[PDB]
Amino acid sequence: SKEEMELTLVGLQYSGKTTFVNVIAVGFNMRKVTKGNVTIKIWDIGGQPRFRSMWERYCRGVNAIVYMIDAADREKIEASRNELHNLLDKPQLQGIPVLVLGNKRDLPNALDEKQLIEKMNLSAIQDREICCYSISCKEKDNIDITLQWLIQHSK
Ligand SMILES: Nc1nc2c(ncn2[C@@H]2O[C@H](COP(=O)(O)OP(=O)(O)O)[C@@H](O)[C@H]2O)c(=O)[nH]1
Numbered sequence: 001s002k003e004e005m006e007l008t009l010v011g012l013q014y015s016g017k018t019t020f021v022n023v024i025a026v027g028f029n030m031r032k033v034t035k036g037n038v039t040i041k042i043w044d045i046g047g048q049p050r051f052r053s054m055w056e057r058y059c060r061g062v063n064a065i066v067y068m069i070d071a072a073d074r075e076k077i078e079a080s081r082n083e084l085h086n087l088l089d090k091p092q093l094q095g096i097p098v099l100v101l102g103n104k105r106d107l108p109n110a111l112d113e114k115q116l117i118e119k120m121n122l123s124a125i126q127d128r129e130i131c132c133y134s135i136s137c138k139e140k141d142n143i144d145i146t147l148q149w150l151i152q153h154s155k
């Protein structure tokens, strides 16, 4: 039956947030995308240091948080891990499901799902449902399963 849901998309700069929205369809960009009888309102929020203080506010009240990672940029994983754990530590975000996406699977040296889970310390995240997929926006790889997970959280 016809529904609407809301997602906030975060993660470091260059991880592929805006690309992902483009494939599925600056400080902020809001877009609505319709899939599987569901209209998804997406907040694509900047990942540069100066925008990270606004992540919490944009995440409050959403159906799901999508956390984008450049899985091939291994140097940035530590920072990515830190920002994700710092975000999920904010009490007002208690219990919101999080989908962690290891983007750029098409590139040499891309971390797989196991490596992302371990290196991002996802297993430590206890208050909520958390999922992690390896994807390529460029080659449209594992985009379908990502959309299915999102739609399943339309509530
Ligand atoms: N090889 C590859 N490049 C990607 C992929 N997704 C995004 N990119 C590239 O990564 C760069 C940053 O993407 P963008 O969507 O601007 O990242 P944002 O800063 O998180 O919004 C751009 O050059 C994209 O073309 C992917 O799946 N594979």
Ligand SMILES: [Mg+2]
Pocket (backbone or CB within 6 Å): 017, 018, 019, 026, 044
């Ligand atoms: Mg962007």
